[PDB]
Structures are given as C-alpha cells and as structure tokens.
Amino acid sequence: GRMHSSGKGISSSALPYSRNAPSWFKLSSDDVVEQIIKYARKGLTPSQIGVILRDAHGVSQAKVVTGNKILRILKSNGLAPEIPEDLYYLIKKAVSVRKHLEKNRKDKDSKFRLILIESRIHRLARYYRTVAVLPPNWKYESATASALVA
C-alpha cells in the first residue's frame, strides 16, 4: 500500500452488510436529495456532504436511501464540479507546496514532496481523461494551476 510511501496502514471504513435503510430511518428518498442539493449549493464537495449527512441527519449511506451515490446525484442536478474533487485537492496541495518552495529554495524535502504530489496528479489526471471525465487535451500546468483551484 501507500503508492508514494512505505506505509502499510489498513484503516478504512467498513460498510455494513445490510444494503437497506435502518428501521429507525424516517426520512424519504426525496428529503435526502434536497438535503444533498442544499449542501452542494453551499459549496460542499461530495465528501463533505456525506460527512454532514451521517453526523447530523442519520444518513448512514446516501446510496442505501436515495439509490444513487452523492456525486451521481449532483451530476443529475447540474452541480458536478468541472475538476473532480480528489484531483482538485491534489492540485490545490501542489499549488500550496509550490508557493512555499519559491520562498524556501533550500527546502529540498518540499522539492521531493512536490515531485510526489505532481506525479500523483498526472497519474490521476491520466485516468480521468481515459474515462472522458476531463477533456482529452486537459493538461496540468504548474504555472496556471492556481487558476483552477482559485
């Protein structure tokens, strides 16, 4: 494990065996959808919407209630971001590291980490182009990266 490290941690979520809503759940398949859309318009990414749903509304999984995954619902309502969320957070991190590097030129560790982050961007961006999520001519530019994650 750990594409860009030697770690071997196994921590992750363990979905329950049951694929049905809990008996105590009373919200309808609709009320969750307007709840999802309401948070998506506030600027939350699909990861944060799911966190708010289980933390404060009892929505264990949006799929077991609504029938569709959170990003699938946003794409059906025209709220899907242009850049996929995980690629967006990688580019934002690379922008932050690159901005720190120009003021700390002797930080050779940050130079090493930037290569890891940018290599991780290119591998993920390459995947998104083959599944036609990004345009075939989409390319990550270090100079113009700040515009995408503005």
Partner 1 sequence: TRTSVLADALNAINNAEKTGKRQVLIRPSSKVIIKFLTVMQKHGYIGEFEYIDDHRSGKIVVQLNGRLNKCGVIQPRFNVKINDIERWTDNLLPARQFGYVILTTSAGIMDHEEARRKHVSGKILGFVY
Q: How far apart are CA 92 and CA 110, in angstroms?
A: 15
Cα 10 off chain centre by: 20
106 binds RNA (CB under 7 A): yes
- The one-letter amino acid at 72: R
Report how far apart, in Å, the C-alpha atoms of 40 and of each of 9, 44, 55, 67 are: 31, 5, 16, 18
Query: What residues have CB less than 8 Å from 82, skipping those under 6 apart?
Result: none
Question: Does residue number 20 form part of the binding site for RNA (CB under 7 A)?
Answer: no
Q: Measured from the CB atom, is 1 or 43 closer to partner 1?
A: 1
Shortest Å distance, C-beta 144 to RNA: 19
Is residue 72 at the binding interface for RNA, with CB under 7 A as the rule? yes
User: Nearest-CA neighbor of 93 among 41, 52, 149, 13?
Assistant: 149
Q: CB of 24: closest distance to RNA in angstroms?
A: 10
State the residues that interact with partner 1 by CB under 8 A. Answer: 15, 17, 19
State the residues that interact with RNA by CB under 7 A. Answer: 1-16, 19, 22, 45-51, 53-54, 60-63, 68-72, 75-76, 84-86, 89-90, 93, 96-97, 99-100, 103-113, 115-117, 119-120, 122-124, 126-127, 131
